[PDB]
Amino acid sequence: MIQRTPKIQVYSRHPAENGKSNFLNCYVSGFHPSDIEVDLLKNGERIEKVEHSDLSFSKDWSFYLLYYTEFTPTEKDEYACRVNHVTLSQPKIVKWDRDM
Amino acid sequence: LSSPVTKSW
Amino acid sequence: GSHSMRYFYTAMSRPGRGEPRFIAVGYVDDTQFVRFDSDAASPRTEPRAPWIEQEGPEYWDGETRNMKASAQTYRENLRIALRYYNQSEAGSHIIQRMYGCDLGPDGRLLRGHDQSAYDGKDYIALNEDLSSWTAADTAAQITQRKWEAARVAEQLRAYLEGLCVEWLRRYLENGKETLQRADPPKTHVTHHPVSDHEATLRCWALGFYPAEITLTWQRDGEDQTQDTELVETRPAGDRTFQKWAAVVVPSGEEQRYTCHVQHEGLPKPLTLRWEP
């Protein structure tokens, strides 16, 4: 039918401080239909223990989900969220930028 | 508390 | 504060991969408190907030019975929708429904809602009078006729004005420590050069509840709606929300820009600037 591609934001629960425990979030929203594949990446590799919220939707019927995992940031490690959806030709990767 | 009402299309 | 309760149902068919999945979640304002998933190992209405946990076995059994009955109804509705739109049995389709009640600061019913969609498009909605329907197309008009003949609106009106409001008030009292607490945003402005003659100012709001917030940039006191990048309000995962707004400004003009923040947790709106 008519399909809507996801918006993606990658960010932390608290402001990041190297060595201090935190949570890494990937928030996907604005998409339809509801099937979606979301991975959290640590230096390009898939993190195993990732939880997510219960499927819900906005007043415009588009779906949203929060994927999240505990992490301890360091100066060296790079984090990202990788998303696939029927609307995407290939997986989209959004890198975590502490300031954005 | 959810609605008990049947909504058959 | 004004308060609302909303349930959100999603039924998704998946030909060749079993019966349609049904998921229901319930919210008070921006706080989820229950879920049901027909794909769970043992589908049950389950608590998702600490203040709902005190409800007794009759509550959980009754809600589980209702949501299992709804799952079966929406599986039939997906079959019915295929007929109404002349669609094949090969494709995946989705029905969504959202319903609930809004209370004013008085605590009295402000208005009720019961709206449904098919494949992400409006299908049928209960009008604000809680007695008539708005159907989006000639398929939904068939449903409308059925529901008129079966007096469905009267039943929904009875729920929305009665149990919906009663139980929302009960939740608001049992959960008052959190549901009736607004956490104001923690705010700051960051500055990053784009180049020698432009810089990004980003106004941050963190740690706030409920989600509703207004973040705006002004230049010389005039709103910069078109030039502002505003991200969607996003959940932090600890009940609170986050948002930012950014503008790109000429180097040397940063003090002409102010960020304005409105939130229920604030006594009065905040004005901030970049502090070098």
Residue numbers in the entry:
A (entry chain B): 0 to 99
B (entry chain C): 1 to 9
C (entry chain A): 1 to 276
Copy text verbatim from the article accompanying this structure deposition:
The human leucocyte antigen (HLA) molecules, encoded by the major histocompatibility complex (MHC) region of the genome, are cell surface glycoproteins responsible for the presentation of both endogenous and exogenously derived peptide antigens for immune surveillance. Polymorphism within these allotypes is focussed on regions of the antigen-binding cleft (cleft polymorphisms in comparison to HLA-B*57:01: Asp114Asn and Ser116Tyr in HLA-B*57:03, and Met45Thr, Ala46Glu, Val97Arg and Val103Leu in HLA-B*58:01). Notably, residues 97, 114 and 116 contribute to the E pocket of the antigen-binding cleft, whilst residue 116 also contributes to the F pocket.
HLA-B*58:01 had the most shallow C and D pockets and B*57:03 the shallowest E and F pockets. HLA-B*58:01 was similarly able to accommodate Arg and Lys residues within the E pocket, although the manner in which the Arg at PΩ-2 interacted with Asp114 differed. Peripheral to the peptide-binding groove are further substitutions at positions Ala46Glu and Val103Leu that subtly affect the structure of the β3-β4 and β5-β6 loops respectively.
